[PDB]
Design a binder for this molecule. Sequence first.
Ligand SMILES: NS(=O)(=O)c1ccc(Nc2cc(N[C@H]3CC[C@H](N)CC3)nc3ncnn23)cc1
Length: 291
Amino acid sequence: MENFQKVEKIGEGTYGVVYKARNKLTGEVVALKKIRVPSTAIREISLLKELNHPNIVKLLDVIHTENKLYLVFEFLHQDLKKFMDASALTGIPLPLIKSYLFQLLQGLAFCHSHRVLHRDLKPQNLLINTEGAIKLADFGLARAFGVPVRTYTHEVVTLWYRAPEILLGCKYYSTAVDIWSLGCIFAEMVTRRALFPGDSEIDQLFRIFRTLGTPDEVVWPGVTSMPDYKPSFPKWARQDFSKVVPPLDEDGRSLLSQMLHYDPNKRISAKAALAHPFFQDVTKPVPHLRL
Ligand SMILES: NS(=O)(=O)c1ccc(Nc2cc(N[C@H]3CC[C@H](N)CC3)nc3ncnn23)cc1
């Protein structure tokens, strides 16, 4: 900690406070995160140091001293949430939406290939620079520490991007949870409105159910026997997708639809999404960032 000088509080996370800081010795500018420790967390966080990729915010160092826990990450200047807000009036241009999606699928394809999931993708852990890069933050941390309802500051954690298998009490998460979340974020970038903004687990389930039809054994084998499934769930009809994310084009709707399949095994993998025709004309535009 004392090897660093706190420049400014650049937010709070689930796991503790996040500071912009500078390495007193090297002068490197970093993101310093103090975590709220057990040996598994240590070995898990250390595995994460190796898991390096241009679309994953780099874990520079893991400091376990004074029996306390700090994570030094590569520093980025903006998240996608703030960028989206800055962009409200005309929205992010589709090329830039496409490039962002393409890059994140690249990061997911990487980590998923090492069996590492995020479990908690949301616009606030997607970080952008002025090179036109976007990066996943806090990758792997959820399996390292443990996902809570309220943050240390009692901030309610968002359910907006949570995959239906989790909401339904599935104990065992596959990589498909991240595709689902990414799909939600994809839709949000296009419409300028969150896809499923639930404010409770049942409200979240039921917003998904309303848009996508109440899942049954036809589309989702084994759904009825899931821990929090209840026959008493209301039965909604799937809506049109042309109604869900206009004015996104055929390719995009085609892609989004596969990222939002109910059955996690039928959900498109990151790997396969990269090969989807939507990405045929992909480019890497530079955003206008006001820092
Ligand atoms: N609000 S903002 O757009 O000006 C902004 C967003 C992010 C950061 N930088 C940042 C912020 C951040 N904090 C987030 C991390 C995810 C967590 N769920 C919420 C805090 N972690 C980071 N890792 C590397 N950079 N970085 C700085 C400004």
